[PDB]
Design a protein around this motif. Structure first.
Motif, PDB file in Angstrom:
ATOM      1  N   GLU A   1      35.985 -55.651  -0.559  1.00 17.89           N
ATOM      2  CA  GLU A   1      34.762 -54.869  -0.356  1.00 17.89           C
ATOM      3  C   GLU A   1      34.971 -53.802   0.726  1.00 17.89           C
ATOM      4  N   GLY A   2      35.695 -54.170   1.786  1.00 20.31           N
ATOM      5  CA  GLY A   2      36.042 -53.264   2.884  1.00 20.31           C
ATOM      6  C   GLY A   2      35.288 -53.604   4.155  1.00 20.31           C
ATOM      7  N   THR A   3      33.961 -53.604   4.057  1.00 15.14           N
ATOM      8  CA  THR A   3      33.082 -53.868   5.199  1.00 15.14           C
ATOM      9  C   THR A   3      33.030 -55.353   5.557  1.00 15.14           C
ATOM     10  N   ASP A   4      32.543 -55.638   6.763  1.00 14.18           N
ATOM     11  CA  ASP A   4      32.351 -57.009   7.237  1.00 14.18           C
ATOM     12  C   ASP A   4      31.100 -57.604   6.583  1.00 14.18           C
ATOM     13  N   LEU A   5      31.301 -58.630   5.753  1.00 16.05           N
ATOM     14  CA  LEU A   5      30.222 -59.249   4.970  1.00 16.05           C
ATOM     15  C   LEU A   5      29.488 -60.388   5.692  1.00 16.05           C
ATOM     16  N   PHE A   6      29.962 -60.763   6.885  1.00 12.61           N
ATOM     17  CA  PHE A   6      29.433 -61.900   7.662  1.00 12.61           C
ATOM     18  C   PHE A   6      29.615 -63.263   6.966  1.00 12.61           C
ATOM     19  N   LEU A   7      30.626 -63.366   6.102  1.00  9.88           N
ATOM     20  CA  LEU A   7      31.004 -64.639   5.476  1.00  9.88           C
ATOM     21  C   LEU A   7      31.756 -65.485   6.490  1.00  9.88           C
ATOM     22  N   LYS A   8      32.734 -64.856   7.139  1.00  5.52           N
ATOM     23  CA  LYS A   8      33.560 -65.484   8.162  1.00  5.52           C
ATOM     24  C   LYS A   8      33.184 -64.964   9.558  1.00  5.52           C
ATOM     25  N   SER A   9      31.880 -64.864   9.830  1.00  5.08           N
ATOM     26  CA  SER A   9      31.397 -64.400  11.133  1.00  5.08           C
ATOM     27  C   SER A   9      31.662 -65.487  12.172  1.00  5.08           C
ATOM     28  N   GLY A  10      30.888 -66.570  12.112  1.00  8.15           N
ATOM     29  CA  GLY A  10      31.119 -67.760  12.930  1.00  8.15           C
ATOM     30  C   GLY A  10      31.117 -67.557  14.434  1.00  8.15           C
ATOM     31  N   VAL A  11      31.838 -68.429  15.139  1.00  3.20           N
ATOM     32  CA  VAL A  11      31.743 -68.555  16.602  1.00  3.20           C
ATOM     33  C   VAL A  11      32.190 -67.266  17.308  1.00  3.20           C
ATOM     34  N   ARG A  12      33.351 -66.739  16.920  1.00  2.00           N
ATOM     35  CA  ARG A  12      33.858 -65.478  17.477  1.00  2.00           C
ATOM     36  C   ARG A  12      33.137 -64.278  16.858  1.00  2.00           C
ATOM     37  N   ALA A  13      33.040 -63.190  17.622  1.00  2.00           N
ATOM     38  CA  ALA A  13      32.332 -61.981  17.184  1.00  2.00           C
ATOM     39  C   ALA A  13      33.119 -61.183  16.137  1.00  2.00           C
ATOM     40  N   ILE A  14      34.269 -60.640  16.539  1.00  2.00           N
ATOM     41  CA  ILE A  14      35.099 -59.780  15.680  1.00  2.00           C
ATOM     42  C   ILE A  14      36.383 -60.519  15.299  1.00  2.00           C
ATOM     43  N   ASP A  15      36.839 -60.308  14.063  1.00  2.00           N
ATOM     44  CA  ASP A  15      38.038 -60.987  13.545  1.00  2.00           C
ATOM     45  C   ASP A  15      39.345 -60.347  14.036  1.00  2.00           C
ATOM     46  N   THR A  16      39.608 -59.102  13.630  1.00  2.00           N
ATOM     47  CA  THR A  16      40.940 -58.468  13.728  1.00  2.00           C
ATOM     48  C   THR A  16      42.059 -59.438  13.323  1.00  2.00           C
ATOM     49  N   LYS A  17      41.883 -60.058  12.155  1.00  2.00           N
ATOM     50  CA  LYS A  17      42.712 -61.191  11.737  1.00  2.00           C
ATOM     51  C   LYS A  17      42.813 -61.333  10.210  1.00  2.00           C
ATOM     52  N   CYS A  18      42.980 -60.200   9.531  1.00  2.00           N
ATOM     53  CA  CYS A  18      43.215 -60.175   8.076  1.00  2.00           C
ATOM     54  C   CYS A  18      43.860 -58.904   7.495  1.00  2.00           C
ATOM     55  N   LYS A  19      44.217 -57.934   8.342  1.00  2.00           N
ATOM     56  CA  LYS A  19      44.479 -56.554   7.916  1.00  2.00           C
ATOM     57  C   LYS A  19      43.329 -56.032   7.047  1.00  2.00           C
ATOM     58  N   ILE A  20      42.154 -55.939   7.674  1.00  2.00           N
ATOM     59  CA  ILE A  20      40.904 -55.535   7.009  1.00  2.00           C
ATOM     60  C   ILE A  20      41.019 -54.133   6.400  1.00  2.00           C
ATOM     61  N   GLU A  21      40.369 -53.943   5.249  1.00  2.00           N
ATOM     62  CA  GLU A  21      40.338 -52.674   4.496  1.00  2.00           C
ATOM     63  C   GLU A  21      41.602 -52.425   3.664  1.00  2.00           C
ATOM     64  N   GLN A  22      42.773 -52.479   4.302  1.00  2.00           N
ATOM     65  CA  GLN A  22      44.031 -52.039   3.688  1.00  2.00           C
ATOM     66  C   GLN A  22      44.855 -53.172   3.033  1.00  2.00           C
ATOM     67  N   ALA A  23      44.217 -54.293   2.678  1.00  2.00           N
ATOM     68  CA  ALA A  23      44.901 -55.376   1.951  1.00  2.00           C
ATOM     69  C   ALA A  23      43.964 -56.311   1.154  1.00  2.00           C
ATOM     70  N   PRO A  24      43.319 -55.797   0.083  1.00  2.00           N
ATOM     71  CA  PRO A  24      42.609 -56.664  -0.872  1.00  2.00           C
ATOM     72  C   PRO A  24      43.452 -57.787  -1.504  1.00  2.00           C
ATOM     73  N   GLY A  25      44.674 -57.465  -1.930  1.00  2.00           N
ATOM     74  CA  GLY A  25      45.582 -58.437  -2.560  1.00  2.00           C
ATOM     75  C   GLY A  25      47.046 -58.098  -2.322  1.00  2.00           C
ATOM     76  N   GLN A  26      47.878 -58.256  -3.355  1.00  2.00           N
ATOM     77  CA  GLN A  26      49.290 -57.841  -3.293  1.00  2.00           C
ATOM     78  C   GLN A  26      49.436 -56.320  -3.203  1.00  2.00           C
ATOM     79  N   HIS A  27      48.502 -55.594  -3.820  1.00  2.00           N
ATOM     80  CA  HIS A  27      48.561 -54.137  -3.915  1.00  2.00           C
ATOM     81  C   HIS A  27      47.303 -53.502  -3.335  1.00  2.00           C
ATOM     82  N   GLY A  28      47.129 -53.725  -2.034  1.00  2.00           N
ATOM     83  CA  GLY A  28      46.077 -53.093  -1.242  1.00  2.00           C
ATOM     84  C   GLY A  28      46.433 -51.691  -0.776  1.00  2.00           C
TER      85      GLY A  28
END
Ligand SMILES: [Mg+2]
Ligand SMILES: [Mg+2]
Ligand SMILES: [Mg+2]
Ligand SMILES: [Mg+2]
Ligand SMILES: [Mg+2]
Ligand SMILES: [Mg+2]
Ligand SMILES: [Mg+2]
Ligand SMILES: [Mg+2]
Ligand SMILES: [Mg+2]
Ligand SMILES: [Mg+2]
Ligand SMILES: [Mg+2]
Ligand SMILES: [Mg+2]
Ligand SMILES: [Mg+2]
Ligand SMILES: [Mg+2]
Ligand SMILES: [Mg+2]
Ligand SMILES: [Mg+2]
Ligand SMILES: [Mg+2]
Ligand SMILES: [Mg+2]
Ligand SMILES: [Mg+2]
Ligand SMILES: [Mg+2]
Ligand SMILES: [Mg+2]
Ligand SMILES: [Mg+2]
Ligand SMILES: [Mg+2]
Ligand SMILES: [Mg+2]
Ligand SMILES: [Mg+2]
Ligand SMILES: [Mg+2]
Ligand SMILES: [Mg+2]
Ligand SMILES: [Mg+2]
Ligand SMILES: [Mg+2]
Ligand SMILES: [Mg+2]
Ligand SMILES: [Mg+2]
Ligand SMILES: [Mg+2]
Ligand SMILES: [Mg+2]
Ligand SMILES: [Mg+2]
Ligand SMILES: [Mg+2]
Ligand SMILES: [Mg+2]
Ligand SMILES: [Mg+2]
Ligand SMILES: [Mg+2]
Ligand SMILES: [Mg+2]
Ligand SMILES: [Mg+2]
Ligand SMILES: [Mg+2]
Ligand SMILES: [Mg+2]
Ligand SMILES: [Mg+2]
Ligand SMILES: [Mg+2]
Ligand SMILES: [Mg+2]
Ligand SMILES: [Mg+2]
Ligand SMILES: [Mg+2]
Ligand SMILES: [Mg+2]
Ligand SMILES: [Mg+2]
Ligand SMILES: [Mg+2]
Ligand SMILES: [Mg+2]
Ligand SMILES: [Mg+2]
Ligand SMILES: [Mg+2]
Ligand SMILES: [Mg+2]
Ligand SMILES: [Mg+2]
Ligand SMILES: [Mg+2]
Ligand SMILES: [Mg+2]
Ligand SMILES: [Mg+2]
Ligand SMILES: [Mg+2]
Ligand SMILES: [Mg+2]
Ligand SMILES: [Mg+2]
Ligand SMILES: [Mg+2]
Ligand SMILES: [Mg+2]
Ligand SMILES: [Mg+2]
Ligand SMILES: [Mg+2]
Lengths: 157, 82, 80, 205, 121, 129
Positions: free
Chosen positions: D14-41
RNA sequence: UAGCUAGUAGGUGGGGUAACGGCUCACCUAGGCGACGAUCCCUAGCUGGUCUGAGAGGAUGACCAGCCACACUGGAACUGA
RNA sequence: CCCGCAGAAGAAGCACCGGCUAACUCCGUGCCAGCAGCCGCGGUAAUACGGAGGGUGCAAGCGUUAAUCGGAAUUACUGGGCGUAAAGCGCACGCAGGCGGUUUGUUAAGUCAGAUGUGAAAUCCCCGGGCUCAACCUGGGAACUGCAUCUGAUACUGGCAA
């Protein structure tokens, strides 16, 4: 106030003594999103060169569209070549439930919600001109009030 | 013989009786002249429960319409009882 | 008053009875255009009073044959 | 019924933060957000007009935790109701109990709020409720029962809700785990990013 | 055109025929099957397409394409027949449902196994 | 041969405006005057007369605002081949209510906006955009 | 499928029907239906509705409810409100 | 329907992913095997075949198939045409039929306005209410593009007039 976008890209052939040289035709419609629209056709040897040539024409060839809030004033036809193009104003609800090419012109024009349908043929070039002919034709109650020289309230109310 | 009887509508385990003026021969849920209120046995202590238009009952019972065992008591429930 | 119907006579060579056309100007359901639809009725009358081709007023009544349920009321505008 | 898969994968696609994995910590910086949907992000998508609509629909589904069959029924209700069709789609989603419980602060994520609803913890107007899709009426009082009150998962989750924007349309006590759903949510109050317009278009055809 | 011409002779609606005479709006039909044989396609293709003459239960005599790689159909063997043309073999307008009745599933198929009637791995 | 007289009037208006013509002469009638008066009343046509005794020639005087004509479009609806009578609630609204429909109701000929409020319907003669 | 039709179409009188009626008879007249489709043919339970559609329409009439029709196939009456 | 117990413990899907249609890398069975709803793929470097494999997509279902409508303004009443694309009878006369210039009467058939009766209940719809919410059931209104009468507008159409 760009809001520029592409409708269609289509490759075309000349055919000469040597062989068949391919060029590409674009079709970009541009507008402010507040009662201004402008299609620009353009054509060139390479693809991305053609869309810049299309965009330059599109900005100059620009038509004004007096429209109510975020929608049309009245149900309006706009025939061109073999494309009829009908489109109704509709309420503050819904979105632009119109066909491809027919809605690219509408969304950048600044109409947020209309009913619409393209009868006859549905050639990307002619339906875009058909809509622009329909929108250019489409008057507003401020124009109609001054035209008959009566009153803005006595007509509308 | 016309008769004032309960029709039984509603879901499974959740009956809702449509007290109705019909011919004796006609089926329970089928043919009728005119419906005359209703009855809800599973309504409980709240806003609605049983409503029975007593003006229309006098038009049929006064003429010659038998009242069924249940509808006879729902008349006894609405008038006096409490 | 009685629910009469005006109608022009088609034939009167039946002895003591008369067949009458009633033109009704109903519209077409789908297309919207009107139609001059006809209603041919058998009608009773005492003697050969009304001839062929004349306007006649008709009233609904007891059946007196197979067909011919309607009956004559009066004569208005006799045969030309 | 539920997704129950890799949740943060949905946020990258999707790109944006969906608040699915929001939880205890505020910001993730822990998935290569935006630039990696799958094998061919790394593949820049062309992205058609049908695409952008279908992406926007999937975003609003995946945020609120709703499936196509139940989501299509919200559109059908939204169309039949008065006013704007777009505003109703979102307003009916926001009136869900698992959404309200999340917006009150009784749950670090919306999935947590859904389970907390499911597991007989949530209670409204003196009545226990198990259903996540319970349409919360205006002028209601959601709350947690005395048995599961002040357990480990809730107290840590309520402290997260202080960092959050906090809606105006509802009010929370915070001391005795007691909520108050006041009025129906306005368009301008929440989000200001997810486009309803494109969802209204998708279902119309 | 002409509103009075339409009153006199209404708009004759185009009664389009069905493609597949399996009859009575049936999803499938049982076939006893006769003559299992290969056939060549039209123009750009060239292949040995597997197909069989289906003696349908209702009395019709049709041809049905056997999908997938390999099959257990021979001489007789009762088979279930679904609608659907192949668009290559002229005349063939049906498929044999793989998995149903005597028509077994395709050997070693994993992706798309509802089509071709194969079990889990 | 000259079956519908009212359609012929509306064409002379539609063609006169296309030709950038000042006035439009034609044979007069009872119904002709009623429509021409309603068009004048609102303000599509700018004045008219009925000059003549034995053979009266009703001439109109067509209006223009800019280079463009005032009558954007005008067409017959209830024509002799297909008569169209509409009820009170089912009366039309031309151009979403900023054009008119000349409707023959009992209380003289009048506009569709006037017909709604007066509380009656009838034969819709012509839309006028 | 352009012609069909002799109790056929009407009258008087007798019988019969809970009730009127070619319902059925005797005689009398020569009609009646038909190009706004008779006749013959093929198919079909009908409706409230159902599905679809922007709507007009298009298709359909399982379940629930009303009405008709039928009871191994063709008849007839008896008994009864 | 409620309350105690034990421990995530018992609890997944099947499409397709050249194009149209959200989703591609490669080992390919080399016009063989096969694919296919249309255009078309497959002839020693394939996003279009099998396969492993990332997703794409949908969820206790999902596919394929049959069937009706839709898109099809491709039977068009709303809403298409007929010089050359399919389509003006070879050209007349003409009864039945459709349509008909114009001012004064007069009727009220059409037409419109009103009113009363009715259009069974369910269904649909809105307002509600009721079952943990929901399907579901259900109270109360609107509607059922009707028709029928009774009385009125009489501009427009017809009739009967001059
Ligand atoms: Mg076309
Ligand atoms: Mg097309
Ligand atoms: Mg195109
Ligand atoms: Mg093309
Ligand atoms: Mg109780
Ligand atoms: Mg008993
Ligand atoms: Mg009279
Ligand atoms: Mg009879
Ligand atoms: Mg489910
Ligand atoms: Mg739609
Ligand atoms: Mg037409
Ligand atoms: Mg097929
Ligand atoms: Mg496949
Ligand atoms: Mg004159
Ligand atoms: Mg005068
Ligand atoms: Mg005899
Ligand atoms: Mg008896
Ligand atoms: Mg349609
Ligand atoms: Mg039928
Ligand atoms: Mg059955
Ligand atoms: Mg049953
Ligand atoms: Mg039943
Ligand atoms: Mg009967
Ligand atoms: Mg028998
Ligand atoms: Mg028998
Ligand atoms: Mg018999
Ligand atoms: Mg007896
Ligand atoms: Mg544990
Ligand atoms: Mg364990
Ligand atoms: Mg070979
Ligand atoms: Mg298909
Ligand atoms: Mg290699
Ligand atoms: Mg493919
Ligand atoms: Mg592949
Ligand atoms: Mg996998
Ligand atoms: Mg299915
Ligand atoms: Mg159509
Ligand atoms: Mg055409
Ligand atoms: Mg030619
Ligand atoms: Mg030709
Ligand atoms: Mg020819
Ligand atoms: Mg010629
Ligand atoms: Mg003639
Ligand atoms: Mg005439
Ligand atoms: Mg006239
Ligand atoms: Mg005439
Ligand atoms: Mg009248
Ligand atoms: Mg009326
Ligand atoms: Mg009424
Ligand atoms: Mg009803
Ligand atoms: Mg109801
Ligand atoms: Mg409410
Ligand atoms: Mg409710
Ligand atoms: Mg409730
Ligand atoms: Mg409750
Ligand atoms: Mg319901
Ligand atoms: Mg009711
Ligand atoms: Mg009511
Ligand atoms: Mg109203
Ligand atoms: Mg109504
Ligand atoms: Mg309705
Ligand atoms: Mg009077
Ligand atoms: Mg007069
Ligand atoms: Mg007067
Ligand atoms: Mg007159």
């Amino acid at each position: 106030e760009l809001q520029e976008k592409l409708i269609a890209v289509n490759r075309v052939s000349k055919t000469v003594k040597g062989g068949r040289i391919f060029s590409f035709t674009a079709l970009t419609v541009v507008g402010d999103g507040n009662g201004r629209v402008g299609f620009g056709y353009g054509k060139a040897r390479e693809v991305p060169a053609a869309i810049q040539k299309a965009m330059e024409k599109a900005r100059r060839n620009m038509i004004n569209v007096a429209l109510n809030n975020g929608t049309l004033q009245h149900p309006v036809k706009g025939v061109h070549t073999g494309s009829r193009v009908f489109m109704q104003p509709a309420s503050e609800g819904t979105g632009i439930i119109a066909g491809g090419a027919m809605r690219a012109v509408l969304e950048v024009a600044g109409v947020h919600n209309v009913l619409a349908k393209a009868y006859g043929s549905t050639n990307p070039i002619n339906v875009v001109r058909a809509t622009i002919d329909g929108l250019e034709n489409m008057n507003s109650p401020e124009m109609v009030a001054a035209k008959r020289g009566k009153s803005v309230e006595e007509i509308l109310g | 013989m016309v008769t004032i009887r309960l029709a039984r509508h509603g879901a499974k385990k959740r009956p809702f009786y449509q007290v109705v003026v019909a011919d004796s021969r006609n089926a329970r849920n089928g043919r009728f002249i005119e419906r005359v209120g209703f009855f809800n046995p599973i309504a409980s202590e709240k806003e609605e429960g049983t409503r029975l238009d007593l003006d229309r009952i006098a038009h049929w019972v006064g003429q010659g319409a038998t009242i069924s065992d249940r509808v006879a008591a729902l008349i006894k429930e609405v008038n006096k009882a409490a | 008053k009685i629910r009469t119907l005006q109608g022009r006579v088609v034939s009167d060579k039946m002895e003591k009875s008369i067949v009458v056309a009633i033109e009704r100007f109903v519209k077409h359901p789908i297309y919207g255009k009107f139609i001059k639809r006809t209603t041919k009725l058998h009608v009773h009358d005492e003697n050969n009073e009304c001839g062929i081709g004349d306007v006649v007023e008709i009233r609904e009544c007891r059946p007196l044959s197979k067909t011919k349920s309607w009956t004559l009321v009066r004569v208005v505008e006799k045969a030309v | 019924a539920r997704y129950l898969g890799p949740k943060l994968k949905l946020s990258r696609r999707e790109g944006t933060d969906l608040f699915l994995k929001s939880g205890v910590r505020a910001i993730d910086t822990k998935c290569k957000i935006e630039q990696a949907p799958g094998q061919h992000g790394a593949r820049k998508p062309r992205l058609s007009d049908y695409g952008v609509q279908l992406r926007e629909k999937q975003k609003v589904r995946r945020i609120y935790g709703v499936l196509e069959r139940q989501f299509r029924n919200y559109y059908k209700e939204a169309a039949r109701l008065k006013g704007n069709t777009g505003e109703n789609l979102l307003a009916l989603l926001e009136g869900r109990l698992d959404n309200v419980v999340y917006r009150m602060g009784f749950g670090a994520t919306r999935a947590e709020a859904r389970q907390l609803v499911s597991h007989k913890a949530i209670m409204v107007n003196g009545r226990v409720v198990n259903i996540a899709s319970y349409q919360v009426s205006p002028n209601d009082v959601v709350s947690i029962r005395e048995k599961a009150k002040k357990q480990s998962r809730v107290k840590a989750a309520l402290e997260l809700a202080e960092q959050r924007e906090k809606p105006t349309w509802l009010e929370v006590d915070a001391g005795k785990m007691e909520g108050t759903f006041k009025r129906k949510p306005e368009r301008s109050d929440l989000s200001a990013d997810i486009n309803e317009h494109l969802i209204v278009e998708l279902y119309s055809k | 055109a002409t509103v009075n011409q339409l009153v006199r002779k209404p708009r004759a609606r185009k009664v389009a025929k069905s493609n597949v005479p399996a009859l009575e709006a049936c999803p499938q039909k049982r076939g006893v099957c006769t003559r299992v044989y290969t056939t060549t396609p039209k123009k750009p293709n060239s292949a040995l397409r597997k197909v069989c003459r289906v003696r349908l239960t209702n009395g019709f005599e049709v041809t049905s394409y056997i999908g997938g790689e390999g099959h257990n159909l021979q001489e007789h063997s009762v088979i279930l027949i679904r609608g659907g043309r192949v668009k290559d073999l002229p005349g063939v307008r049906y498929h044999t449902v793989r998995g149903a009745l005597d028509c077994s599933g395709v050997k070693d198929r994993k992706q798309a196994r509802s089509k071709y009637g194969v079990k889990r791995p | 041969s000259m079956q519908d007289p009212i359609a012929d009037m509306l064409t002379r208006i539609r063609n006169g405006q296309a030709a950038n013509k000042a006035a439009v002469t034609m044979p007069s009638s009872k119904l002709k005057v009623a429509i021409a008066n309603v068009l004048k009343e609102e303000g599509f046509i700018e004045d008219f007369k009925v000059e003549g005794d034995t053979k009266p020639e009703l001439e109109l005087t067509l209006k223009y605002f800019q280079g463009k004509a005032v009558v954007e479009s005008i067409q017959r609806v209830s024509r002799p081949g297909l008569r169209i009578y509409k009820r009170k609630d089912e009366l039309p609204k031309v151009m979403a209510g900023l054009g008119i429909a000349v409707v023959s109701t009992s209380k003289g000929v009048m506009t569709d906006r006037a017909a709604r409020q007066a509380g009656l319907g009838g034969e819709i003669i012509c839309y006028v955009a």
